[PDB]
Ligand binder design. Sequence first.
Ligand code: MN
Length: 271
Amino acid sequence: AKKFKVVTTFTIIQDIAQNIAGDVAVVESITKPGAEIHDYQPTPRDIVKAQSADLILWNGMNLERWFEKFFESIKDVPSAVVTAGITPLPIREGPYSGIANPHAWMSPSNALIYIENIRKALVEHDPAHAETYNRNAQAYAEKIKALDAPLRERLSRIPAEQRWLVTSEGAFSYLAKDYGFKEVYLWPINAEQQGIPQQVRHVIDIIRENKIPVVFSESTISDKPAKQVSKETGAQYGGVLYVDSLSGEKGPVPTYISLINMTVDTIAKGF
Ligand SMILES: [Mn+2]
């Protein structure tokens, strides 16, 4: 009858978890493709959705500023933080300085740890399907491991000194560390905040000093500040990167694997 039901806070976890669950459990996301996840405002239908689940997955590292208050309205549903065991990179400036940068999934090696935490959660709370979860997790982990070589090859045309990654949110720190990029951003983490117009001038100084050819925005936030930066520098606007959300199932970024590939592909294109 009713399959084991998993509810996640946002879409990236949904797709990783669904790959481990296979045909044996149904995984749904509270947030919709394209929606901003950091300061999402849960509605009454989200409570019913989360309350209907057998297990709730969230990122932690205070990604979902809304989750803990929301979860107080949910009774008798176990939850698991899928970043357990990941060493955080701290936010480097702004009013959230020193807090964990929550975007750990942009490192494919960190995704192996996401996968293991989700597998553990599913095996524990749905032990009747532990064998399917264990098989699916190991197969999906191998798919993630197979990304490292093509990803580095795709970025290999860009010499080390020119590997500057200029984005809107500083959401790519884990990806940048993995593939040897230095990061510049217009704001360190999505939030309601001051300091963005002045950071735009500092970034402009950095674009000129280092001859950076391309700046990017992201799929859940406005492209306007990055487009402005491109106008008042030489650098071209390299388009939209994906980090905080997948696209819809027929859009360009329907899976976690496609999010990593398309973000790296768009970066490489921009150079
Ligand atoms: Mn973000």
